Structure formats: structure tokens, C-alpha cells
């Protein structure tokens, strides 16, 4: 954990989080985000810190995927990659919904 000693499950690109373009990196036990062309992740959340997950449909000028944490905080991920947004939006959702039941289990 913390260090780059974990495998990457999914690498999403041109993912804008908080109006800034970066990349969405899915990890074995957590989800992280880092701006485009960067090596230092700015956001990191373990699948056990995620309470709920929502998914913003197509139709907007921005496609999104958000994680509602038990703390009340919410991390909405905007897939601004015209070429893989929709496709990666599902890929992340899929991995998340599949990983969540493995980490999410503590009556909270």
C-alpha cells in the first residue's frame, strides 16, 4: 500500500476530476487519480471507504462515475476521453461493483 507495490487494475485516461484532466487508475484494493502526464496520484480511496457508487449517463457534455464515501464525501469522475469515455466508464463501474462486495463489509 501507499508505494507502487500494487498492481494496476485499470488505467483510464483524460479523466477530469474537479475540472482538471488526468487519469483514473484502478488498483487492487483502491482507486486513485493522477493528472495527465503525472506520476504522483492526488486522490486515493480504498474500496472499503466507498459507501455507494453512482453513474452519470451519456447525453451531457461530460460523462461521469462517482463514489459516495461513508464519510459523506463524494468523488465524481468525469470521463472526458472522447474515444474511450463511455467504454471506460463501464469498465470502471464493472470493476468497482465487482470489487466493492469484497471490501465493503463492516456495517457502514
Amino acid at each position: 500500500m501507499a508505494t507502487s507495490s500494487e498492481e494496476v487494475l485499470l488505467i483510464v485516461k483524460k479523466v477530469r476530476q474537479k475540472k482538471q484532466d488526468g487519469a483514473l487508475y484502478l488498483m487492487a484494493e483502491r482507486i486513485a487519480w493522477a493528472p495527465e502526464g503525472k506520476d504522483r496520484f492526488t486522490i486515493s480511496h480504498m474500496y472499503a471507504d466507498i459507501k455507494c457508487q453512482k453513474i452519470s449517463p451519456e447525453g451531457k457534455a461530460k460523462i461521469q462515475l462517482q463514489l459516495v464515501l461513508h464519510a459523506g464525501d463524494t468523488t465524481n469522475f468525469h470521463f472526458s476521453n472522447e474515444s474511450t469515455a463511455v467504454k471506460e466508464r463501464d469498465a470502471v463501474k464493472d470493476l468497482l461493483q465487482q470489487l466493492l462486495p469484497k471490501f465493503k463489509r463492516k456495517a457502514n
Binding site: 474537479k18 475540472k19 459507501k51 455507494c52 457508487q53 453512482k54 453513474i55 452519470s56 449517463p57 451531457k60 461530460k62 461521469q64 462517482q66 463524494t74 465524481n76 468525469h78 463501474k93 461493483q97 466493492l100 465493503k104 463489509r105 456495517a107 457502514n108
Partner: peptide, 22 residues
Amino acid sequence: DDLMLSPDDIEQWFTEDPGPDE
């Protein structure tokens, strides 16, 4: 919000998991 955060135009989701909290 205070600035131009995500809720600038966002809360039209399908909340994949809005029930279980186990």
C-alpha cells in the same frame, strides 16, 4: 458549490448502489 465543482451540473445518476450498506 464555492467554486466550479462537479455539482455545477451533476446529480442525474442511476446510483448503481444506493441501498446495501453492509
